[PDB]
């Protein structure tokens, strides 16, 4: 009925005596600069717009009603809100707003601003928002009390509204949410944009009189006076800039960099620290999306064949120092991954749709193709050939052509110019040995963003962000009605997916019913070969210039850079 803390599943870790998180130093000193890289470019400051390339960190301009801890999958703690009263089914909540809550101009954050914000997303926001919150109302029932009512139960959908940025009506009444912003909006978080150069840098300054600096969720965080993002057109130029000291911190995503290029005077003299930690929670995964709305990838057999042409064991051994693990799940390294045979609860979910399922969903555990790693896997390439031929794509000369029409089998791989892409030519070569032509097109960050959003590609790389439980967000990425959300990478509209996700969205907060539902969905998504699995590693590889100190404990779901601070003694030992 009344609480200070919420959890999507289970109970919140910091439900009692909450003074600060475990993964901060509450005494961390304020001051100093951290300089970071970003790849590509940006052209505006509105993260929530229908178009444009928003600046680094422009999704954290605003405080929210509650904020999530970084050492838990989905637990919410007071930020702008102090507390909430609620129905046992979470279908309604009355949120008490902290009377100290202020925007950067020193004006109050009120229940009206929250009501205004919800209506703003509903009428000018991304089209998925009004679809998800279609039966929902958000009303200021008192100056500092906002009442949220859902039309149907959705504990996660309710808690997700706690993460909505709270906009100041006084500013946003004059700007459409759907339009990009050439200058930063009036905001409220612990850092404000203070200068920038369009497409090149953004500087954030710590708000020194931030109203919430001493809330428990904020203690020991937001330590740096300045956070600077410099933009680099590709990762090789950024990595060389890092080694020369042009920015302070690097997340290393290239296996060859890590294995062979962390060398030179700066490492010998220990000006740069390098660190590698096993990461035991849910994992981001890389994939290549097949646009299944294009005729070239409409047939599951052709998608299966092209997958067989991707020689991961060769790439890992010859190119990547054995660093990577093969992606094999949409719930990678969680309990929701379909890594065993369906149990009885899964078959109750699955058997009704047997006619619309690959039969392997019932008989086999999904395993991406394995080669011996020698190059030229003959079993896998012969199977690819067999499947292509069945789908009507047959060799005429050295080229695969449609058996009916004589059209060559050809597609374009769309790539960001900014990425390393060492796997691309070997994949192209493998495809060429099957008679498949893959054109490579590298484009800038603004073209890539636009085309990724509109699905104007045959194939492109996509990251599937870690999903620690089967979230109601899955509908946005996979359900037919959300096809134009920008998150449905293959273009799939399936009644099987829809039905399993409708079940999931009706079981929000219920781990017992979500376990077999997540596994079931995982079998459907994987066995349809909607995307070509690439790789991940359960290990964070970080390097930084030795000017920082860190809390003893690192959070489970993030690197915790926002808990670091500038260490004047370590920094004094580095050259200019």
């Amino acid at each position: 009925k009344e609480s200070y803390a919420f959890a999507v599943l289970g109970e919140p870790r910091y439900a009692f005596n909450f003074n600060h998180f475990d993964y901060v130093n509450p005494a961390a000193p304020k001051g100093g600069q951290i300089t970071l890289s970003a790849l590509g470019t940006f052209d505006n400051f509105n993260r929530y717009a229908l178009r444009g390339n928003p600046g680094a960190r422009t999704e954290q301009l605003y405080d929210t009603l509650f904020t999530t801890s970084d050492d838990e999958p989905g637990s919410y703690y007071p930020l702008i809100a102090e507390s909430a009263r609620y129905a046992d089914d979470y279908s309604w909540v009355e949120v008490a707003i902290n009377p100290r809550a202020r925007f950067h101009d020193g004006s109050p954050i009120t229940a009206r601003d929250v009501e205004f914000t919800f209506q703003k997303f509903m009428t000018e926001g991304v089209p998925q928002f009004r679809l998800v919150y279609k039966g929902t109302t958000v009303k200021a029932i008192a100056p500092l009390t906002v009442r949220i009512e859902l039309a149907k139960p959705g504990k996660e959908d309710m808690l997700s509204l706690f993460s909505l940025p709270v906009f100041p009506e006084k500013y946003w009444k004059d700007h459409k949410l759907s339009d990009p912003l050439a200058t930063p909006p009036l905001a409220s978080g612990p850092y404000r944009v203070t200068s920038w150069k369009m497409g090149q840098n953004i500087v954030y300054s710590r708000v020194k009189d931030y109203w919430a600096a001493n809330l428990p969720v904020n203690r020991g965080r937001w330590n740096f006076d300045t956070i600077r993002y410099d933009y680099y057109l590709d990762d090789n130029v950024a990595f060389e800039a890092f080694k020369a000291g042009a920015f302070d911190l690097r997340m290393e995503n290239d296996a060859k960099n890590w294995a062979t290029r962390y060398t030179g005077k700066n490492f010998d003299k220990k000006y740069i620290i390098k660190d590698e930690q096993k990461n035991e929670s849910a994992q981001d995964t890389r994939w290549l999306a097949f646009n299944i709305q294009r005729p070239v990838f409409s047939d599951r057999r052709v998608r299966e064949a092209i997958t067989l042409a991707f020689d991961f064991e060769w790439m890992n051994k010859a190119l990547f120092y054995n660093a990577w693990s093969r992606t094999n799940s949409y719930f990678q390294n969680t309990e929701y991954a379909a890594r065993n045979y369906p149990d009885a609860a899964e078959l109750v979910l699955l058997a009704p749709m047997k006619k619309d399922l690959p039969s392997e969903v019932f008989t086999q555990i999904y395993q991406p193709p394995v080669s011996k790693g020698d190059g030229y896997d003959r079993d896998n390439l012969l199977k690819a050939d067999k499947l292509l031929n069945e789908a009507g794509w047959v060799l005429k000369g050295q080229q695969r052509v449609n058996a009916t029409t004589g059209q060559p089998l050809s597609f374009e791989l769309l790539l960001p110019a900014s990425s390393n892409s060492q796997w691309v030519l070997p994949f192209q070569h493998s495809l060429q040995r099957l008679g498949i032509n893959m054109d490579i097109r590298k484009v800038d960050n603004s073209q890539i963003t636009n085309r990724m959003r509109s699905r104007d590609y045959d194939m492109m790389p996509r990251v599937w962000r870690a999903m620690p439980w089967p979230s109601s967000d899955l509908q946005i990425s996979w359900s037919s009605e959300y096809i134009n959300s920008t998150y449905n990478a293959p273009g799939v509209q399936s009644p099987v997916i829809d039905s399993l996700i409708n079940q999931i969205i009706a079981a929000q907060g219920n781990k017992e019913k979500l376990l077999p539902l997540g596994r079931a969905l995982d079998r459907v998504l994987t066995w349809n070969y909607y995307m070509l699995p690439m790789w991940y590693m359960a290990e964070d590889r970080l390097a930084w210039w030795d000017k920082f100190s860190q809390p003893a404990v690192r959070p489970v779901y993030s690197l915790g850079i926002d808990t670091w601070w500038y260490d004047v003694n370590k920094a004094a030992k580095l050259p200019s």
Binding site: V132, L164, T486, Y487
Partner: peptide, 7 residues
């Protein structure tokens, strides 16, 4: 993501 478009 319910509030913004991909990246």
């Amino acid at each position: 993501m319910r509030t913004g478009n991909a990246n």
